[PDB]
Amino acid sequence: SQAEFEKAAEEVRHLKTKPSDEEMLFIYGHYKQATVGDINTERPGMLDFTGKAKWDAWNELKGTSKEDAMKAYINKVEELKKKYGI
């Protein structure tokens, strides 16, 4: 639900240990897919590697519905809370 999505977006900021870059990109990609939906931008160029990594994570989810990305985002945050603590 929307209230669960809001709770998860808050709780993920409070993990006691920083998740891996892969976990952080799962969170970023699904957050975008659950809100904007399919990627609507061009991949960052030049030396913006942080931007390219985020873009690639969101691009891989093209086709996923907002509702399914939201559910996966919430589930991942709950997984991260159990893994790292809050």
**Known binding residues for an acyl-CoA:** 13, 28-32, 54, 73
Q: Does 48 bind Cl ion (CB under 5 A)?
A: no
Q: Which of these, 27, 23, 30, lies nearest to 64 by C-alpha position?
A: 30
**According to CB under 5 A, which one of 4, 11, 56, 68 is a site residue for Pb ion?**
68
Q: Does 21 bind Cl ion (CB under 5 A)?
A: yes
Q: Judge whether 28 and 54 are in contact, CB under 8 Å.
A: yes
**Options 12-20, 33-41, 63-71, 73-81: segment touching Pb ion (CB under 5 A):** 63-71
Distances (CA, A) of 6 to 3, 11, 34, 36, 41: 5, 9, 11, 15, 24
Nearer to Pb ion by Cβ, of 52 and 71: the residue is: 71
| Contacting residues toward Pb ion, per CB under 5 A | 68
